[PDB]
Structure 1
Amino acid sequence: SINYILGLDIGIASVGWAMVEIDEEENPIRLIDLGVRVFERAEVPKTGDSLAMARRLARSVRRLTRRRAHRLLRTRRLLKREGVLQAANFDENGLIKSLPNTPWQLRAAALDRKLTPLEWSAVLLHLIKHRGYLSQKELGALLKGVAGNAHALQTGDFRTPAELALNKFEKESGHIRNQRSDYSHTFSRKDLQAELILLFEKQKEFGNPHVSGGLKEGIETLLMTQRPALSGDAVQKMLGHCTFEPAEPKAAKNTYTAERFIWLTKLNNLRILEQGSERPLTDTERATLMDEPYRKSKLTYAQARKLLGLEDTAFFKGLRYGKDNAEASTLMEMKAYHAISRALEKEGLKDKKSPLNLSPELQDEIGTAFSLFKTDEDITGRLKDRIQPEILEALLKHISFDKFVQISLKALRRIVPLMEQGKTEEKIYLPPIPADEIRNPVVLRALSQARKVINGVVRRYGSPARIHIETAREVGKSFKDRKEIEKRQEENRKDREKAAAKFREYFPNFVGEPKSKDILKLRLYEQQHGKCLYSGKEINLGRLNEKGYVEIDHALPFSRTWDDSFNNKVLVLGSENQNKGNQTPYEYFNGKDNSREWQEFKARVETSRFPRSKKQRILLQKFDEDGFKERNLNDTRYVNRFLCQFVADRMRLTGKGKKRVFASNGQITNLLRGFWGLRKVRAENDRHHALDAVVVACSTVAMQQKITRFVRYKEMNAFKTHFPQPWEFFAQEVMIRVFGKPDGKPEFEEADTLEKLRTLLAEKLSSRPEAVHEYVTPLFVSRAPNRKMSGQGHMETVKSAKRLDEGVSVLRVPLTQLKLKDLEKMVNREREPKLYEALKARLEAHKDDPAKAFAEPFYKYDKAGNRTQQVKAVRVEQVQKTGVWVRNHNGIADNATMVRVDVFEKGDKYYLVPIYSWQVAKGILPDRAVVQGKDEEDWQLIDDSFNFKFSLHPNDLVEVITKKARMFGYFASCHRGTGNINIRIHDLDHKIGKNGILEGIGVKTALSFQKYQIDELGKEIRPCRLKKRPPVR
């Protein structure tokens, strides 16, 4: 029932919001609410991988192990039913009893010998288990090892690959099987089938029974039967669908039509940029250069310039270069066309001169056949039964295509003829973000949390009249892209520091601290070659620092163009060219008739070494003022465009009815933040998100107009006048409401209750009674709850647990990691004293570096040492208090995460019961609390005497009222060996605790340990009480 505008600050891990009440003409009058919603990034915390991809890899590994076990089980069933395997010779598990552990020697000697059925089953099960690799970076290396062993058997004197395997791998070293990354031992599946059939032949020749039965077949049934691969249905389902015919799957870029379409689109989005003039390619030019991707191989931008007729200084737009535009880039190529041509050249079908006889439709069919199927067999078998076979083996020798495009085939095949010539219901609450449209985990999570915030706002207050979303420059970028951005920011900092050093060296007489304006003045003057860009005079370097002599002025007027760029500024003197006004350097320099002044102005802005983009922007004077202003005012990224369309379509907005979703740009938000007096501190707190959300929610069109008219008044003389503020004392009110402390003074105590915040607002803003309304509450950053009860069950290292009566967890440590600290905790340390001093010498010789000391092989020595054996890894005892029993109770692991931590009274003492993920899977709910020092076996036992209070999850709000002080925040972790919780302050304030967390909280004797519940808006703070203990399963 209140008109208001909502802003947002969507980030990778935080969505700060704010709602600003507006009047009948959408002019902000008050600020009625705000807050920040912090959440975990939807990425792997290390290397920023895809969580879904990692889970899929784990599931695929599980599937592989399950299939291998099932295949070996079926092999054992076959051996039990095909003739005999000495029926009932199996254990209780069904395995093989007394299986001969020499199956490589069995494959070697089975060529001429009558194998015992036990040895016959040993060799056979060996063949199924290690059944080689089939064709179906790292893969190329593995195929290299496969090919090497394949050639050895073809040209060698050994029939079976295993025969050469042992007979030469025992000469080379002591191992026959593959080790670490030595692919010299890998075999191939076709050679294994040949070995199997010749083995059956030999076992038949030597009168061995159990050979001629149904086995000889069933063995190939188990050996070569394989799960097939994907089809076009996966491409349809997991990617987009064509609007015209969703039934149609997606084309591939390795087709002629797709390459033509992308080339034509690139032509449509390419212009000619010379002397600050942007001109599209003419029809004659388009026809002239269209032949280039087929006449030659690659289309370099410099090559394109050389082929056509244009000036040398003419660069190309659309090439998003960070810096160093001197090097030319490449436009695009016919990947499929050139690949087919070079394959035909290499296979005696092309000479780089004859035209490609295959039709473009035929090329499309070939590309679709090569891309839809991931194996050679299916391609060769089907091919849609189209083309001749000779070129089929020609292509399959080298050509491999795997890619897809965004449009359906037909759709492209119908648009191309028309383009070659040159041409739901709205409701109150926002619906779920469509996972199909946003195929990015981090952005999807951010948008879902933003939708949660919007829904909470709508529920509490009503439909927003307008939405002012703007996201950080990091959303919509890969993790490597974000790392590149932060790195470039780091060196951009170093560079700023070096520039400040340069300025202080040049002008030691200058006092104070070099700000951005003067440092920009100096750097640009260095780049301007010591000359003003209005009259072309030599200006006084000494007088550069002082005010009045020089002043930064945007050549393109700010009121009509709305440009605020890093280097779109011209170092003009002042009082000598104050007649520019809002006229742009076209009529002030009189470029209408190419006056002389214009001529040398262009010459001095192009001959003198200035950035190319600056040379271009300063010299446009031929743009659409409103369109260019809206290009530099809004943002048109994929995510912002999607948000605009989705929010406009799928929720109520009681606005003016034309465009009620306004996606802003980062530069304009930063500029208006600067004008309205940001100051203070940021990036050390989590409330600057709400600050920027308030700032963007006051960037209404009326305010861009008040800014426009003020800047227009300021351009010419027209003569402390405050810059347009949304209301009086805007900065004071906003920074009291966001942070709780006045401006410039981050040392005062935060007013974190309604009473003290209201009193502070009334005492500091007595002139503005609208700062204190019914909705004035202190900001409380809300962290997204994580009540999930699943996760890694146990670290991935399995440690021997025979000696678990003590604390030791003996494990094999490779020598390339054996440190001096790992020699003390070694098993045969007194049992074999000589090797203890033999290994310790190598630690001391190379200065405690196992990688270099043990790069050469280490060896044991006899009493009179004579090079007996070699040490590669040695056992290392490690203390193991508690762990998870894994591998059918053959090894122990380490606990992964606490999925829940219950609390228990009886003694005014809160006992904490840690519940781990492996316990939830087994349905086991622990009955033991935590006590310091003593192990789990001595832990306090839980019975009916212990009152149950609640259960703790990570990022779940709690309050420990210890006697000394009260502590509030979100539970993070617990010291298992010490039993103290870790509490994160709500805003992660960097001046409280260790980087915002309160470690080592004393809960065992706290006056009251209880947990609260926080709304998605960060409001409605109240304790939550459980009645009964919740089951784990």
Structure 2
Amino acid sequence: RSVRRLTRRRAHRLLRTRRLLKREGVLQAANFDENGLIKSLPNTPWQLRAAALDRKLTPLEWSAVLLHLIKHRGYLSQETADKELGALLKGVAGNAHALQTGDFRTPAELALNKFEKESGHIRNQRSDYSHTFSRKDLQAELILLFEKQKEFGNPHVSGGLKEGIETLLMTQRPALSGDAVQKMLGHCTFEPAEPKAAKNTYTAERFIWLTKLNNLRILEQGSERPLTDTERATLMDEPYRKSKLTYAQARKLLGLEDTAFFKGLRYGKDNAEASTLMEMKAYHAISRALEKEGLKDKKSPLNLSPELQDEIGTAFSLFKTDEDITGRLKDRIQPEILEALLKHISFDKFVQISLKALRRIVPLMEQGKRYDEACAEITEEKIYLPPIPADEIRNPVVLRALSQARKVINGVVRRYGSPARIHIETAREVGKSFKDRKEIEKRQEENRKDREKAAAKFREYFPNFVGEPKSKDILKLRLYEQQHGKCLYSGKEINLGRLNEKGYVEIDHALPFSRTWDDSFNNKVLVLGSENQNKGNQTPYEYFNSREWQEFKARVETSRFPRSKKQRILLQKFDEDGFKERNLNDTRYVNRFLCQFVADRMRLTGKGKKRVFASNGQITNLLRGFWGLRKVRAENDRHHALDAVVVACSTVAMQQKITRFVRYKEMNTHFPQPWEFFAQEVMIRVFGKPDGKPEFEEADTLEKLRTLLAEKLSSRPEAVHEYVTPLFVSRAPNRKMSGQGHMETVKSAKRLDEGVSVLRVPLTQLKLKDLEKMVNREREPKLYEALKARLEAHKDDPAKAFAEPFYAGNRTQQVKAVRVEQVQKTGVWVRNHNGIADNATMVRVDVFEKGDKYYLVPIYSWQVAKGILPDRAVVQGKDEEDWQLIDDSFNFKFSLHPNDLVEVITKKARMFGYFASCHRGTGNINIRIHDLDHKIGKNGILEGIGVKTALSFQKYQIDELGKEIRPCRLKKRPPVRS
């Protein structure tokens, strides 16, 4: 869009310039051609610009010069942040200094002599900003040229032409206004009238700081506590007084010195206390701005008002040009101060809260209240969930995921009525930056390889171990090494030669699972089987009371456990219920938003007042393991439903039953399941096979599935009923008729009667495969052999071989790029039918049947724009010209958009799945398998299905839930445009 607008406005400016030339006489009225372009305009405007200082030009030469000035009107400043814009500005300043200092009067003459001498070319190439000019220099040049040509006797130096041309060369539309840019972000959620704050604001920075200070609590070895009011008061003003408040500086200020660690701080990482915990960017930016020119007392506080600081920050963030900011803070700041700020300050970044709202909010956070509480401090339920508010969900991935979850919810409600409760489990990856998720993938694979090394070591130590070691076994061995070979509950030495003889050393939960629901790696110790049998539902404090507990604490303190584990192991007094609830729920932003939104805006026949649960991922995995749902060996997208069952069975009653069982088991049978053969029933329902077992055949159909359920669960009466249908994964369709019209690079279309095109290929990109197809390898063999040998010497490195300039027996004119022929049997006409480009992506495929043969007519997006419903259907190898013309002898069946469900019955077999691609060189189609099972095709995609000679080729419809799978019959062929 911005590229379109730029080219449009440039062409419009040049057109207006030509109209102004014609109106005020010069190039009187007939130098123009059929469509207003100047005929035989000279091709030496740089030279004429340089010689315009010394000579009356000519109507034509003068016109060409000014059109050249308008076309290349240089850079305007509109001040030092980026790499590339920084480099362009550096080059601009270099040329400005050179023009004002050396023996040069204007850009034209300096450009001619200096640039042709130093390089042999004027205009920039490929990215270089050496020859770039600022608009100021060119405006001075235009004024000087008008003066000089008034001296030299040019009939056209009229005041009209001067005013018009100055306006044409200098004018640009304003960048976005304050009110419009503010409207871009939503209005405040606490003060509806007001806009969302800028980040670089005293109030906003203070809110961030107060949030950080209030949420940082000190973990003392064997307790929790937040910084006392004296500590907060100590730290409160330090970000302003110092440049940055290092965590180590805060530790010195509070003098913890040892055995007291900060909570909410990764203490495993070495020198963690060197973190740059907080820096007030706006305050110090303003102070440095004033200091750097003499308006600021260097080591004493910034005297600008806090309110005034909010205003200054917002002002500098709301205007993007010297003029606008000058107006705003010309009202609001003293001229020297405003000038100093305008000379160096750069702002950005809004903060999604109202400065008015934050003014009231910040006293609560500042004194030391909690983050969430302050918001509270300060009824339309419907059957179908309303759309997800895009304002509160500021993330495209999260918004699309929530929208499809809403579609699922609404479809479920239509089919089966209002639910009693809705339980939710959202992935960790939801709501993470692409950077964050990339780092997470990196760490996950790192951990995979670390566990692979650990497994190899387990194999070396235990050669006779049955198969490959699971997770608990590797944990056993590493805990053995971490505990000095001594069981932590008794201190008796342990063998390690056994370790896997059943009932010898066990993994006990230090804090009892029944009271904490915690089975992390911080709460699991390796104890001996004999001494573990008498612990009960006791904590380590509650079991060994005393110097015995002191010996136990000495052992735990003398272990290679991380600090977190040692602290957790040795706690006596905590809020049990709080911990069991916290390990049971997920408190991320997405889950809280969904739980509040669904509860508020949807009717549920709930038991009462909460009826929305955000399951913690860990406990869902735990319940899956404990309910017999082994982590499958499957590509299936189907596993998502499996988890969905577990989260749906995770209710308060089931939780309390599990807690009762665990409490019984620790003080000395089936792990409680929701009902008998739950595992087997859910597995058959999800995978259509006795659990897992990819060797079995799948129950594709209702008959097969119900008979399988009644055979392998004859005991279970209600396992079969009127709703049990095979799972079919539903792919959101994509019937969009718009999109990229063609590929981006434009090619020469002259030699297209024979299938070919020509492209200027740089030598830096020129490879031996490309080089083998140069147009003039035959007609310039000297050049061919030279390039071949030179490039060969550098082992097919284009940039390395042709980094050295490539050129009578001496060197002749250089080469930067050579023309290379490329294959072109089809294309799209572009740039005024002066170029060809490759087809982009088919937006539709129309299917015809005639005499038990199928014909696929492809429809691309450029055809939709031009509005030409195509004639010809594909034929295997023939170029587009020799294709099957469609007429009334053919029967139209259906149109295929990507991700439409299709059925291809052929002689070999029957294929069912979502249409994905239709290769145009073969007339075959690819279809994604509905669950993307990797055992099928290549990653779940059947490639090269030939439908020309199929028996049946039909298209189906399917809804959100995967129901209502029926063939659809299209009456008339639909058009491309309306």
TM-score tier by shorter-chain length is over 0.9
Q: Quickly say closer, same or farther: Cα 1:531–1:370, change in 2 above 3 A.
A: farther
Deviation readout 1:28-62 (Å, 9 max, x if unpaired): xxxxxxxxxxxxxxxxxxxxxxxxxxxxxxx1111
Q: Quickly say closer, same or farther: Cα 1:925–1:153, change in 2 above 3 A.
A: same
1:322 Cα deviation from its structure 2 partner: 9.1
Give the TM-score normalised by structure 2.
Answer: 0.96
Partner of 1:869: 813
Q: Once structures 1 and 2 are overlaid, which stretch shifts more, 741-750 or 641-650? A: 741-750
Contact 1:235 1:249 in 2 (8 A): no
- 1:539-618 matched pairs, under 5 angstroms: 539-589=494-544, 595-618=546-569
Contact 1:564 1:668 in 2 (8 A): no
Secondary structure at the counterpart of residue 875 of structure 2: coil
Deviation readout 1:8-31 (Å, 9 max, x if unpaired): xxxxxxxxxxxxxxxxxxxxxxxx
Partner of 2:399: 444
Q: Quickly say closer, same or farther: Cα 1:302–1:684, change in 2 above 3 A.
A: same
Contact 1:794 1:895 in 2 (8 A): yes
Q: Quickly say closer, same or farther: Cα 1:417–1:672, change in 2 above 3 A.
A: closer
Partner of 1:116: 58
Partners of 1:695 and 1:419 in 2: CA distance: 40
Deviation readout 1:414-447 (Å, 9 max, x if unpaired): 3334554334411111111111111111111111
Q: Quickly say closer, same or farther: Cα 1:615–1:471, change in 2 above 3 A.
A: same
Q: Quickly say closer, same or farther: Cα 1:325–1:527, change in 2 above 3 A.
A: farther
Deviation readout 1:963-992 (Å, 9 max, x if unpaired): 121111111111211101112111111111
Q: Quickly say closer, same or farther: Cα 1:186–1:212, change in 2 above 3 A.
A: same
Deviation readout 1:145-195 (Å, 9 max, x if unpaired): 111111111212211122211211111111111111211111101111111
Which residue of 607, 621, 626 maps to 1:675?
626
Q: Does 1:496 align with 2:444?
A: no
1:883 Cα deviation from its structure 2 partner: 0.3
Q: Once structures 1 and 2 are overlaid, which stretch shifts more, 832-841 or 156-165? A: 156-165
Partner of 1:21: none
- 1:889-968 matched pairs, under 5 angstroms: 889-968=833-912
1:815 Cα deviation from its structure 2 partner: 0.9
Deviation readout 1:77-131 (Å, 9 max, x if unpaired): 1111122223122222212211222222122111111111211111111111111
Q: Once structures 1 and 2 are overlaid, which stretch shifts more, 955-964 or 572-581? A: 572-581
Paired residues in the alignment total 964
Q: Quickly say closer, same or farther: Cα 1:975–1:70, change in 2 above 3 A.
A: same
Partner of 2:937: 993
Give the TM-score normalised by structure 1.
Answer: 0.91
Contact 2:241 2:301 in 1 (8 A): no
Q: Quickly say closer, same or farther: Cα 1:528–1:167, change in 2 above 3 A.
A: farther
1:391 Cα deviation from its structure 2 partner: 2.4
Contact 2:26 2:63 in 1 (8 A): no
Contact 1:555 1:584 in 2 (8 A): yes
Secondary structure at the counterpart of residue 936 of structure 2: coil
Partner of 2:691: 743
Q: Once structures 1 and 2 are overlaid, which stretch shifts more, 186-195 or 400-409? A: 400-409
1:375 Cα deviation from its structure 2 partner: 2.0
Partner of 2:419: 464
Secondary structure at the counterpart of residue 245 of structure 2: strand
Contact 2:329 2:338 in 1 (8 A): no
Partners of 1:990 and 1:523 in 2: CA distance: 35
Partner of 1:185: 131
1:1032 Cα deviation from its structure 2 partner: 0.3
Contact 1:680 1:744 in 2 (8 A): no
Contact 1:954 1:973 in 2 (8 A): yes
Q: Quickly say closer, same or farther: Cα 1:547–1:352, change in 2 above 3 A.
A: farther
Q: Once structures 1 and 2 are overlaid, which stretch shifts more, 234-243 or 517-526? A: 234-243
Q: Quickly say closer, same or farther: Cα 1:1015–1:322, change in 2 above 3 A.
A: farther
1:656 Cα deviation from its structure 2 partner: 0.8
1:511 Cα deviation from its structure 2 partner: 4.2
1:539 Cα deviation from its structure 2 partner: 3.2
Which residue of 87, 97, 102 maps to 2:29?
87
Deviation readout 1:770-789 (Å, 9 max, x if unpaired): 11101111111111111111
1:377 Cα deviation from its structure 2 partner: 2.4
Q: Quickly say closer, same or farther: Cα 1:709–1:200, change in 2 above 3 A.
A: same
Partners of 2:693 and 2:361 in 1: CA distance: 63
1:577 Cα deviation from its structure 2 partner: 4.2
Q: Quickly say closer, same or farther: Cα 1:598–1:113, change in 2 above 3 A.
A: farther
Secondary structure at the counterpart of residue 672 of structure 2: coil
Contact 1:820 1:848 in 2 (8 A): yes
1:575 Cα deviation from its structure 2 partner: 2.1
Partners of 1:459 and 1:469 in 2: CA distance: 19
Secondary structure at the counterpart of residue 870 of structure 1: coil
Contact 1:235 1:250 in 2 (8 A): no
Q: Quickly say closer, same or farther: Cα 1:269–1:818, change in 2 above 3 A.
A: same
Secondary structure at the counterpart of residue 829 of structure 1: coil
1:509 Cα deviation from its structure 2 partner: 4.6
Secondary structure at the counterpart of residue 702 of structure 1: helix
Q: Once structures 1 and 2 are overlaid, which stretch shifts more, 786-795 or 618-627? A: 618-627
1:235 Cα deviation from its structure 2 partner: 4.5
1:453 Cα deviation from its structure 2 partner: 1.0
Q: Does 1:346 align with 2:292?
A: yes
Q: Quickly say closer, same or farther: Cα 1:870–1:471, change in 2 above 3 A.
A: same
Q: Quickly say closer, same or farther: Cα 1:904–1:115, change in 2 above 3 A.
A: same
Contact 2:506 2:529 in 1 (8 A): yes
Q: Quickly say closer, same or farther: Cα 1:971–1:510, change in 2 above 3 A.
A: closer
Partners of 1:1016 and 1:917 in 2: CA distance: 27
Secondary structure at the counterpart of residue 902 of structure 2: strand
1:327 Cα deviation from its structure 2 partner: 5.5
Secondary structure at the counterpart of residue 266 of structure 1: helix
Secondary structure at the counterpart of residue 159 of structure 2: coil
1:646 Cα deviation from its structure 2 partner: 1.1
Q: Quickly say closer, same or farther: Cα 1:933–1:586, change in 2 above 3 A.
A: same
1:466 Cα deviation from its structure 2 partner: 0.6
1:326 Cα deviation from its structure 2 partner: 4.2
Which residue of 313, 316, 332 maps to 1:367?
313
Greater relative contact order (Cα 8 A, min sep 6): structure 1 or 2?
1
Q: Quickly say closer, same or farther: Cα 1:1009–1:687, change in 2 above 3 A.
A: same
Contact 2:508 2:532 in 1 (8 A): no
1:676 Cα deviation from its structure 2 partner: 1.1
Contact 2:537 2:663 in 1 (8 A): yes
1:680 Cα deviation from its structure 2 partner: 6.1
Gaps of 5+ in 1: 1-58
Contact 2:705 2:726 in 1 (8 A): yes
Q: Once structures 1 and 2 are overlaid, which stretch shifts more, 609-618 or 445-454? A: 609-618
Q: Once structures 1 and 2 are overlaid, which stretch shifts more, 822-831 or 580-589? A: 580-589
Secondary structure at the counterpart of residue 277 of structure 2: strand
Partners of 1:65 and 1:320 in 2: CA distance: 52
Secondary structure at the counterpart of residue 418 of structure 1: helix
Contact 2:844 2:859 in 1 (8 A): yes
Partners of 1:642 and 1:929 in 2: CA distance: 51
1:853 Cα deviation from its structure 2 partner: 1.6
Partners of 1:618 and 1:71 in 2: CA distance: 75
Deviation readout 1:833-858 (Å, 9 max, x if unpaired): 11111111123212222232222222
Contact 2:211 2:365 in 1 (8 A): no
Deviation readout 1:795-842 (Å, 9 max, x if unpaired): 001000011111011111111222222223211121111111111112
Deviation readout 1:431-488 (Å, 9 max, x if unpaired): 1111111111111111111111111111111001111111111111112222222221
Partners of 1:440 and 1:665 in 2: CA distance: 22
Deviation readout 1:357-379 (Å, 9 max, x if unpaired): 22222222221221111222221
Q: Quickly say closer, same or farther: Cα 1:604–1:800, change in 2 above 3 A.
A: same
Contact 2:872 2:883 in 1 (8 A): yes
Q: Does 1:712 align with 2:663?
A: yes
Q: Once structures 1 and 2 are overlaid, which stretch shifts more, 626-635 or 673-682? A: 673-682
Deviation readout 1:924-963 (Å, 9 max, x if unpaired): 0111111111111111111111111111111101111111
Secondary structure at the counterpart of residue 900 of structure 1: strand
1:793 Cα deviation from its structure 2 partner: 0.4
Partners of 1:409 and 1:795 in 2: CA distance: 47
Contact 1:579 1:588 in 2 (8 A): no
Deviation readout 1:387-411 (Å, 9 max, x if unpaired): 2222223222222222222321122
Partners of 1:703 and 1:824 in 2: CA distance: 72
Q: Quickly say closer, same or farther: Cα 1:82–1:618, change in 2 above 3 A.
A: farther
